[PDB]
Amino acid sequence: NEIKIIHLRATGGEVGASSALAPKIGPLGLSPKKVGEDIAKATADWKGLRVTVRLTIQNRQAQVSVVPTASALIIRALKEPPRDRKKEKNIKHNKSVSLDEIIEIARTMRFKSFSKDLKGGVKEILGTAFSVGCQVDGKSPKAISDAIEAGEIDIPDE
Amino acid sequence: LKKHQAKMTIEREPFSETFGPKAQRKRPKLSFNTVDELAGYSEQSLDSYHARLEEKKLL
Amino acid sequence: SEQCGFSLKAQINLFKSIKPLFANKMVFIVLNKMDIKKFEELDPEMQQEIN
Amino acid sequence: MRYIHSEETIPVPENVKVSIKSRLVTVEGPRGKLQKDLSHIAVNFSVVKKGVIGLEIHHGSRKDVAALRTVRTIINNMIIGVTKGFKYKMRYVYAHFPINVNVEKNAETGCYEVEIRNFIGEKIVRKVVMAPGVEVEISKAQKDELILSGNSLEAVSQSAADIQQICKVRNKDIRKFLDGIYVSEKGNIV
Amino acid sequence: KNLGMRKNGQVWLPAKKAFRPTKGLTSWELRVKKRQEQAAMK
Amino acid sequence: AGTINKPKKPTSKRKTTRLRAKISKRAAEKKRKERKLARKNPEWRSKLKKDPGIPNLFPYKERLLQQIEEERIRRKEEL
Amino acid sequence: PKSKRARVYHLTQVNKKGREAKERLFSNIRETIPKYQHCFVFSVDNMRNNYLKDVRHELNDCRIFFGKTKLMARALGTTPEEEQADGLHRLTRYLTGTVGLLFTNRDPADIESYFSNLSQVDFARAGTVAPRTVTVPPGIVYSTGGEVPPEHDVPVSHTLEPELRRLGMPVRMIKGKVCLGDEKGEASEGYTICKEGEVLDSRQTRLLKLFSICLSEFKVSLLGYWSSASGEVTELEAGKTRPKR
Amino acid sequence: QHLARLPDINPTTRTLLVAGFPNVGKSSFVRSVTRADTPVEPYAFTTKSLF
Amino acid sequence: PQNEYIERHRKLHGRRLDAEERARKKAAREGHKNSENAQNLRGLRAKLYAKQRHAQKIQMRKAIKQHEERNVPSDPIPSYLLDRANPTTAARFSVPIPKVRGISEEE
Amino acid sequence: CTVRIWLVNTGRTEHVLSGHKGSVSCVKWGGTDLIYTGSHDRSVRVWDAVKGTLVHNFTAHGHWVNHIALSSDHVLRTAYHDHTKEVPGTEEERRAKAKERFEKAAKIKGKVAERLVSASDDFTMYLWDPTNNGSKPVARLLGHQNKVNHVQFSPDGTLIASAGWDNSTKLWNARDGKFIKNLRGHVAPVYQCAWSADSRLVVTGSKDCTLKVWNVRTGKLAMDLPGHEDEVYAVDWAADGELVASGGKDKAVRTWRN
RNA sequence: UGGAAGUCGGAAUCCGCUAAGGACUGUGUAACAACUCACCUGCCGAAUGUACUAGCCCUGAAAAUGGAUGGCGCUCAAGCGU
Numbered sequence A: 001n002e003i004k005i006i007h008l009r010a011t012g013g014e015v016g017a018s019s020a021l022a023p024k025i026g027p028l029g030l031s032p033k034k035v036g037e038d039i040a041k042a043t044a045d046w047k048g049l050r051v052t053v054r055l056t057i058q059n060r061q062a063q064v065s066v067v068p069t070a071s072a073l074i075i076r077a078l079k080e081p082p083r084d085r086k087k088e089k090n091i092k093h094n095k096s097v098s099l100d101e102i103i104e105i106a107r108t109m110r111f112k113s114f115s116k117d118l119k120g121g122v123k124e125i126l127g128t129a130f131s132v133g134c135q136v137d138g139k140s141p142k143a144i145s146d147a148i149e150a151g152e153i154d155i156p157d158e
Numbered sequence B: 001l002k003k004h005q006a007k008m009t010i011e012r013e014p015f016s017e018t019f020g021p022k023a024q025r026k027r028p029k030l031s032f033n034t035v036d037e038l039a040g041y042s043e044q045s046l047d048s049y050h051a052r053l054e055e056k057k058l059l
Numbered sequence C: 001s002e003q004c005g006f007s008l009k010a011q012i013n014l015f016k017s018i019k020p021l022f023a024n025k026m027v028f029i030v031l032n033k034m035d036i037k038k039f040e041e042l043d044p045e046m047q048q049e050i051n
Numbered sequence D: 001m002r003y004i005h006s007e008e009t010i011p012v013p014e015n016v017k018v019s020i021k022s023r024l025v026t027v028e029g030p031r032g033k034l035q036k037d038l039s040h041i042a043v044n045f046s047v048v049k050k051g052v053i054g055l056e057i058h059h060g061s062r063k064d065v066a067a068l069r070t071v072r073t074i075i076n077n078m079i080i081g082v083t084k085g086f087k088y089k090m091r092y093v094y095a096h097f098p099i100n101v102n103v104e105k106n107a108e109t110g111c112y113e114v115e116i117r118n119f120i121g122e123k124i125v126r127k128v129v130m131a132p133g134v135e136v137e138i139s140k141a142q143k144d145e146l147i148l149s150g151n152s153l154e155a156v157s158q159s160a161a162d163i164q165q166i167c168k169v170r171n172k173d174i175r176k177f178l179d180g181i182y183v184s185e186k187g188n189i190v
Numbered sequence E: 001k002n003l004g005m006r007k008n009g010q011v012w013l014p015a016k017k018a019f020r021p022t023k024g025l026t027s028w029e030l031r032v033k034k035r036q037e038q039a040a041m042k
Numbered sequence F: 001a002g003t004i005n006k007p008k009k010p011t012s013k014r015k016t017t018r019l020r021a022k023i024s025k026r027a028a029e030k031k032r033k034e035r036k037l038a039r040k041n042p043e044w045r046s047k048l049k050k051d052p053g054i055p056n057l058f059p060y061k062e063r064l065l066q067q068i069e070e071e072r073i074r075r076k077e078e079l
Numbered sequence G: 001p002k003s004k005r006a007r008v009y010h011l012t013q014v015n016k017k018g019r020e021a022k023e024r025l026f027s028n029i030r031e032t033i034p035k036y037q038h039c040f041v042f043s044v045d046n047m048r049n050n051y052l053k054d055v056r057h058e059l060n061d062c063r064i065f066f067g068k069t070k071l072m073a074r075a076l077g078t079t080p081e082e083e084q085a086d087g088l089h090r091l092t093r094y095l096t097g098t099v100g101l102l103f104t105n106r107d108p109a110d111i112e113s114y115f116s117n118l119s120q121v122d123f124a125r126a127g128t129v130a131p132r133t134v135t136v137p138p139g140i141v142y143s144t145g146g147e148v149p150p151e152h153d154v155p156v157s158h159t160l161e162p163e164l165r166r167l168g169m170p171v172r173m174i175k176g177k178v179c180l181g182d183e184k185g186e187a188s189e190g191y192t193i194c195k196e197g198e199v200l201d202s203r204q205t206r207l208l209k210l211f212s213i214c215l216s217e218f219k220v221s222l223l224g225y226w227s228s229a230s231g232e233v234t235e236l237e238a239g240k241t242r243p244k245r
Numbered sequence H: 001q002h003l004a005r006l007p008d009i010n011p012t013t014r015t016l017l018v019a020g021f022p023n024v025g026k027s028s029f030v031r032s033v034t035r036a037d038t039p040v041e042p043y044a045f046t047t048k049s050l051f
Numbered sequence I: 001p002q003n004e005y006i007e008r009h010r011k012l013h014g015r016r017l018d019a020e021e022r023a024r025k026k027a028a029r030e031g032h033k034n035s036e037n038a039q040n041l042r043g044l045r046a047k048l049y050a051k052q053r054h055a056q057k058i059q060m061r062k063a064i065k066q067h068e069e070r071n072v073p074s075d076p077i078p079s080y081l082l083d084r085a086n087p088t089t090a091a092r093f094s095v096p097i098p099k100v101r102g103i104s105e106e107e
Numbered sequence J: 001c002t003v004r005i006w007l008v009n010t011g012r013t014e015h016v017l018s019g020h021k022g023s024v025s026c027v028k029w030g031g032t033d034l035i036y037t038g039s040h041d042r043s044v045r046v047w048d049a050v051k052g053t054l055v056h057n058f059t060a061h062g063h064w065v066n067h068i069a070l071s072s073d074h075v076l077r078t079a080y081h082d083h084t085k086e087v088p089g090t091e092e093e094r095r096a097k098a099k100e101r102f103e104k105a106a107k108i109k110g111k112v113a114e115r116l117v118s119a120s121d122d123f124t125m126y127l128w129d130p131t132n133n134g135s136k137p138v139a140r141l142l143g144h145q146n147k148v149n150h151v152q153f154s155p156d157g158t159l160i161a162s163a164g165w166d167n168s169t170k171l172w173n174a175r176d177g178k179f180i181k182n183l184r185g186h187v188a189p190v191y192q193c194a195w196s197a198d199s200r201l202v203v204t205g206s207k208d209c210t211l212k213v214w215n216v217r218t219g220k221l222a223m224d225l226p227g228h229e230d231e232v233y234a235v236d237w238a239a240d241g242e243l244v245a246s247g248g249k250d251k252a253v254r255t256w257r258n
Numbered sequence K: 001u002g003g004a005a006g007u008c009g010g011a012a013u014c015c016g017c018u019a020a021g022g023a024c025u026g027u028g029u030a031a032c033a034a035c036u037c038a039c040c041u042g043c044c045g046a047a048u049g050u051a052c053u054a055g056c057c058c059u060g061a062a063a064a065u066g067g068a069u070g071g072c073g074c075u076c077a078a079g080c081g082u
């Protein structure tokens, strides 16, 4: 009757995420192949992306959900061409994502943000996009964040 | 080519990246590609090793 | 029992892949962890493939 | 630069009697009596207040001013020794050969003696004679533990240091061979 | 009793004061006024 | 080192006449050589040396600066 | 003085703040003064105060200042000549010790009810009185020190053994396991971290924090608040008894 | 240093070579039948060298 | 023993009980020891010690200056010559050395 | 370590080809919308330009890839311009003529197959046919005693010229990658080579401040061109063969005529 | 990357909450955890910190019979400066 919460990192559309999960969920009474099947089914909307997966265990069955992260949301919004990760390595996320999608990602991530306003959330998402290495409106996300701080760009409230 | 192969190998992979506390080498350089080639290579390697031992004993 | 984190498909495929190395050698497949799952509990075309 | 006047103070508890004569300090408390000769240090002792000892140096250099701090700590440690006492707890650990510790008291000299046997299987018997005023007991609350107690902190700590230094591994890798006797705790008896 | 730990473990050591042999030659207010005058001069 | 128990051969401070005369000759030759090098020195030297100024710890430095200011004002007014 | 301690130059990113941080705190407090109806003064004495982040997140419509006490007093204005608002200098008498400011537009009754209902279990700091006796049992040392049952507990990490020895527990390393005495709970009594009614010291509180045992609580005590409309300061129960300066 | 810490393996003696996927019990079997101190852990690639 | 057996022994048994305290006390005594070495070593050993400490002081000053300044090719070449080890590259018909010491026939 | 594709009208990036671990030293755009990249991570990559995706990854070179050349480079640089000098009237006929010239240059055994050559610092070259051979090289060109700096197909597709750092230009058969003859007149590393339009002559510009015109059928030094005061960095031969341009460290453009 | 969560590496190194807290200074883990430093607050309480300069002192290289400020010896000098 005790709920067990396990957080893991998984790639979407793959069954190999349970390989490191099986030695601990085996004694817990879970079927590793079934758990990998539910993980792939939950992460089918995040193909080729590293996502955070939450497993809630109650009476020897696992509920599988995807916890949204800013990095995964930005890389998904970049709309990169599909590729084979075994053969296409050392890739860069150098495409562009518009400020409207940045604000939408901030609205999605409002449940995690401790900022007082959506402007602060947007600046956090712009910093994450700067870390990823993409462009916002064809320019640097640091430059857009500087313009937002200076007041040239207006961010909607809530 | 053989006169420059050593410096070419060291320029490609430095000694600190090959072995040591900061080494980044993960894949070895192999003279075989398939399992059947590996089995054949092991057979001829054992034969050549035995031939070298026999010629050293005879010498 | 596949608590190692890998499928029995993958284990049998790895054995078949490294089988050419086993020429002129003696091969024993040891099925471990019988305290978790026995061989008779397997869904029987797996038993057939192991045979 | 010479400093005209420098001063330190030592509080004295109500159950402590301090007598200073020609820079010889005698401290008496509930636990006993300690003595120390401080005639190697130039200092004027006085009674600035009830229960307060004053120490001063006139026309001294920076070194002479600084030496009063050492004198203050020495006298304070004697006061603490006659009030609460000092206790060092040591632990002896081993890998394969159990270290045997025997504690006796010599009636002729009044000093305790510690005998250490089977230190990494050695056949020699190590003998440490303790400083006078240092009581040694084998602990019953914990495993493989010695307790050293006394009024003189210097005597107790030097006795513990002698016990630690007599059990020294030689010509072996000290990453691998971990046997020895080590000071595990320092504090007051009370 | 003492509430903090001493790093070397000698817990009987008193709470020492800073070694300032020139302490008491100048008051605080005079030093403040001298600070302002020196800043203006500089 | 074991200097106290087993001291070594002492280092003599008694000078010899030969070494004293040699050192005096070398000092004189070094002085003449340094004078020649200063004559032929191509390093740049300022016409006016840099002044250290007035020390900060001098308690009447501000009054001295005031006196300098009034003196230069009077000099500019007279000239 | 040729003989001196060598000063370590830190090769880290963050530098010392200086007077710029003080001026920034002054400007922030003085600019947040006119935007709010009430200014509460609260105290958190001998507490870990890391839950003030959660308090800040919950009171997103309010502003919280937790700064240097004298700097916040000077920002408010300790005298009627230097006060930033009418009657604000009366609030500065509460600014002693570990205190903070809370600018709000909410109801003072709502603020008082929220801070009366706010409760959290926290690790004790040095100086608090121990509410109960804590004893680590002999044998294998577990991660919670015997608070939870050892069947549901996990063995403690082997990297904590020198720290436990340094904090005074006579533990030893037996085949990768930290043990108090023997592996089977023999030849040694249990280790008493603290006794009931004993004033805790920092070694004991560090041991309790390492074993994840909470013997104290986080409680914010409101001392009094100044209202901008009336210009007056209302005293509360904690401010009635707390020393003032 | 690595060569000095290398294990001594005789290629021309009676040898039992234990192989397979990670986390299947190879080190547990070698510990159970020999005196070698090869670690046993639930995570993959616990054994990174020949024992 | 085989592979990383000293690390495994550290993991299973730890170190000697006084290892951390002795290491900390030695690192604390390092300053007195360095001053004693500077004032008490003799001869060629002292000369090499002084040279080596001069080197450490210069390197430490350079590192401190670089960390202080943390918050702040030459000749044009084609693209195929980029990232290669290129040389720095820095009437009276007089030679660079017009006069040298004359060598007598006896020498 | 990237290649960016730009739309010239709008100035924005359509695709970013990434995956190289070193600097992309050379890029080529073939006539079937395949982009070829040679990098300092010892790799030669083929990309589908329409999708912006990776198609081929060749990892045969042992050192930096310096230059890559396509068998259709000469006609792809000039599009519909040719010897006639009357352009077609409309865009459709101009595009048809350009595609016809490309297919005529790139046909191998009756089918269009662009051939690729890569010259590297490992003293070698690799000849590739991605369409027919795929990841297997057609040949490895061996014989340079130092780094190969530049490589170029002849306009008729029968020869390959290569300029190396061993003061030598070498000639190879473009079909099987077999050595033919060594051109030996330079005394410093040869940086650039350029073919004439009729594939009889190749001009080489070297570090010894000279250009040299070679007759490839006799394998001899036809013309010596001195006059550059310092090193020669860039050499081009015009498509109609009237002029050779050279430039380098002496800052002056030199044009050479018959 | 088999694994790599500030701390095996390559490159970036931004924002929020801030009183302040590096996309991290070290210890540590297989990877996490845990500890620690930079930085901040409370206690305390009055002067300090850094770098240079000038004096005197130590080191700044020595062989080989036993010896030399001339010798005794000299330490608020019987040494050094006026």
Ligand SMILES: [Mg+2]
Binding pocket: H022, H023, H024, H040, H041, H042, H043, H044, H045, H046, H047
């Ligand atoms: Mg395992």
